[PDB]
């Protein structure tokens, strides 16, 4: 499914890599992050899991929480004010909110917007 | 086919719009732009046709030429150094070169990279 063109690994070459999806817990505060109520889109990277955006039904989200792979702790990441779009889901049309990670650069912001576009448009 | 999520028209809403494709003439110099040897991806915009990137088989391109819609003249746009990727075409695998318009901002650069990604990856 979802893909993005990675600027790399070498030269000026372009490699398609997967924009993977995982369930995650978000909320209005760090304490608020209870159960799984959003979908995080991420790249695997030199740091590890790099999360670019969350997709959720809620519009109040300001925080997302991820447990480290290893199991040695958790990370709380700040979300930007969301973006709303409509997509025709199996249960009918619904508003979805797209939260970019706070501080996400314009290139990665564009990669997500281009990558999701065909599936938002599909009915 | 190709789509991108437009940040607009209002609020923080997201609208899927088509990333349209048109044949065009490119070359190593402005004079070199002879016949149709590339594919320009463009948005329709408040200025008119906004071209974001060219896709071509040639790797020597530095210029692209578009006749104005109206017919009152032509535009020569400067291309950035290209990016190469491989895609399995009906005639087998071929290298393609992606030329971003000179000065293209990172958001639009990312939108193109994300939008093309699923079709590069497909066989």
Swiss-Prot record, chains A, B:
Domain Nsp9 ssRNA-binding, which positions? 11-123
Location in or out of the cell: Host cytoplasm, Host perinuclear region; Host cytoplasm; Host endoplasmic reticulum
| Organism domain of life | Viruses
**How would you summarize the oligomeric state and partners of this protein?**
Is a dimer. Interacts with NSP12. Interacts with host SND1.
Job of this protein: Forms a primer, NSP9-pU, which is utilized by the polymerase for the initiation of RNA chains. Interacts with ribosome signal recognition particle RNA (SRP). Together with NSP8, suppress protein integration into the cell membrane, thereby disrupting host immune defenses.
Q: What protein name does the entry list? A: Viral protein genome-linked nsp9
Species of origin reads: Severe acute respiratory syndrome coronavirus 2 (2019-nCoV)
| Organism ancestry | Viruses, Riboviria, Orthornavirae, Pisuviricota, Pisoniviricetes
Tell me what gene encodes this: rep
Residue range from the parent sequence? 4141 to 4253 of 7096
